[PDB]
Amino acid sequence: PAPTTAGAGWDAGVGALVNPSRRRGGTLRLVSSADVDSLDPARTYYVWVWLLQRLLNRTLMAYPTDPGPAGLVPAPDLAEGPGEVSDGGRTWTYRLRRGLRYDDGTPITSDDVRHAVQRVFAQDVLPGGPTYLIPLLDDPERPYPGPYRTDEPLRSVLTPDEHTIVFRLTRPFSDFDHLMAQPCAAPVPRRSDTGADYGRDPRSSGPYRVARHEPDTLLHLERNPHWDRATDPIRPALPDRVELTIGLDVDVLDARLIAGEFDINLEGRGLQHAAQRRATADEVLRSHTDNPRTSFLHFVAMQPHIPPFDNVHVRRAVQYAADKILLQDARGGPVNGGDLTTALFPPTLPAHQDLDLYPTGPDLRGDLDAARAELAAAGLPDGFRAVIGTQRGKFRLVADAVVESLARVGIELTVKELDVATYFSLGAGHPETVREHGLGLLVTDWGADFPTEYGFLAPLVDGRQIKRNGGNWNLPELDDPEVNALIDETLHTTDPAARAELWRAVERRVMEHAVLLPLVHDKTLHFRNPWVTNVYVHPAFGLYDIQAMGLAE
């Protein structure tokens, strides 16, 4: 077992590969506290299921098997090369590898990739996954109702032959290769598409296929006999079998993982408190632990639609009066509370910059003089009363720290807790709920659906991205024409350097608005058993790249 033999070392799997091997064979024993949300590649919105999909389904482009920065750049998978860009970022062409096959022996064609993309449009039948493709491909003058309501193909997607696909976008989109790397764009052959029931028997284009799924119990994967190693530049497919055990209590999971009963935690939410203190204190256990950034941001949003947060000076007062140390401690500090940040972008993104418009004093505990001056500017020199929205648990601890911070300048907050399960769909993520409860501040965390500045920041601040019916991530409902225009400019800017500078201007303007108070960039503790080969934190996921792993002889 792990506690008896020292491993590769603390953080050895962060930016580097642990225990490299090409040895095939064995059963990779994975564990999760939760069942998959879906086995339909189009209907999953769990990061760890996207990660699992790297074993089950290939895509035109895929994140490469690389612990370094190149891991963030989609690489050719089913396509022979990266997306060919024409029409100023509006037209994307891919050329498919020939003779590739699904697990049933049938051919993979460009029609199947179009079909997969078309499926996303059938939100009445296949809800649950990302929908970035819809506005990029839909004609507002001639809406596409999905592939079940019409057999006429999407007019923005051409398949001139069985090995060519052309996407004609409604607007320039610099990040299209990223969209083609998502499981909702993995080919689905229409012949096998059972619609709402697809997850019960999905086709596989990857090295593994579903052998058995028992809800809340297990998921077993076996080799796909028709997957061709010589045609796949991404996947080493080392284990003969992958067995996921599902439904364990989180502390039960950690204990059994550390004991060696499971190889790796697939769900990847990190070690819980008890195992955190155990692993970080023991020299042998430390050697089996990685402490990566997850690329998630923990922040507080302020809503101009809820007075007095319409006033920029109220919002700046809150930023200045934030006790960043106390807030980090609420998040797991002093030693496990992520990485303090005064801006939004994670350091993985090119546009990451030094930006601290509202410094909190020499000890980072708040500039109360500056906060009081801002309150005076708002016509509220003695403070005011407001409500902060949050979840039960860790979010509540953060909310309490906001209450404590702001009370120092006469901002008297009470806390409104919202249901955990629907927090993003019907809680903080629903504009009507925010108004109903008068939630001037909201505690949340956020991770991009793809590792780019657009993926990270646009859902948070782009006026066109306000979701009025729920699932909203632009909590302040910022709709600044200048921010929107800058975002549009990045999307057609070919030069990565010029694009980064534009994104820096976006972030600066957002911070000028003071609608988002950055707290920390989240970190996590992953435990790796020493007999697992090729363990590394994938930079696009903040989780180990399960598909790369094998077992030692």
Backbone angles phi, psi at 230, to 5 degrees: -65, -15
Measuring CA to CA, which residue among 411, 300, 321 is closest to residue 367? 321
The residues pairing with 79 across neighbouring beta strands, listed in sequence order, are 96
Pick from 365, 372, 257, 268: which is nearest to 314 by CA? 372
On whether both 383 and 452 belong to a single domain, the answer is yes
517 by Cβ neighbours in 10 Å (0-12 / 13-18 / 19+) ranks as: buried
Do 341 and 197 fall within a single domain? no
Residue 260 and residue 350 in one domain: no
105 and 161 assigned to the same domain: yes
Asked if 514 and 310 touch (Cβ cutoff 8 Å), the reply is no
| H/E stretch holding 522 | strand 516-523
Q: How many domains does the chain have?
A: 2
Helix (H) or strand (E) holding 318: helix 312-320
Structure token pair of residue 343: 């801006």
Preceding peptide of 67 cis, ω within 30°: no
What does the alpha-carbon distance between residue 71 and residue 78 come to, in Å, rounded to a whole number? 17
Check which CATH number belongs to the domain holding 542 and give it: 3.40.190.10
The sign of the dihedral angle between the CA atoms of 499, 62, 151, 131 is: negative
**Which CATH number do you get for residue 480?**
3.10.105.10
- Number of Cβ atoms within 10 Å of the Cβ of 442: 26
In whole angstroms, give the CA distance from residue 265 to residue 32: 6
Residue 518 and residue 528 share a domain:
no
User: In one letter, which amino acid is 386?
Assistant: A
* Rounded Cα gap, residues 77 and 280, in angstroms: 38
Return the closest-CA partner of residue 416 out of 404, 430, 433.
Answer: 433
- CA dist list (Å): 35 to 85, 95, 190, 193, 290: 39, 35, 27, 23, 24
Q: Look at residues 275, 308, 329, 344 and name the one whose alpha carbon lies nearest to residue 511.
A: 344
Residue 522, phi then psi, degrees to nearest 5: -65, 145
For 507, the domain range is 293-523
Helix and strand element counts for the chain (H, E): 15, 23
Is the domain of 231 the same as that of 244? yes
Residues 411 and 386 sit within 8 Å (Cβ to Cβ): yes
Helix (H, G, I), strand (E, B) or coil at 265: strand
CA atoms within 13 A on the CB side of 387: 15
What's the one-letter identity of residue 31? V
Same domain flag for 103 and 230: yes
Q: 405 and 309 in one domain? A: yes
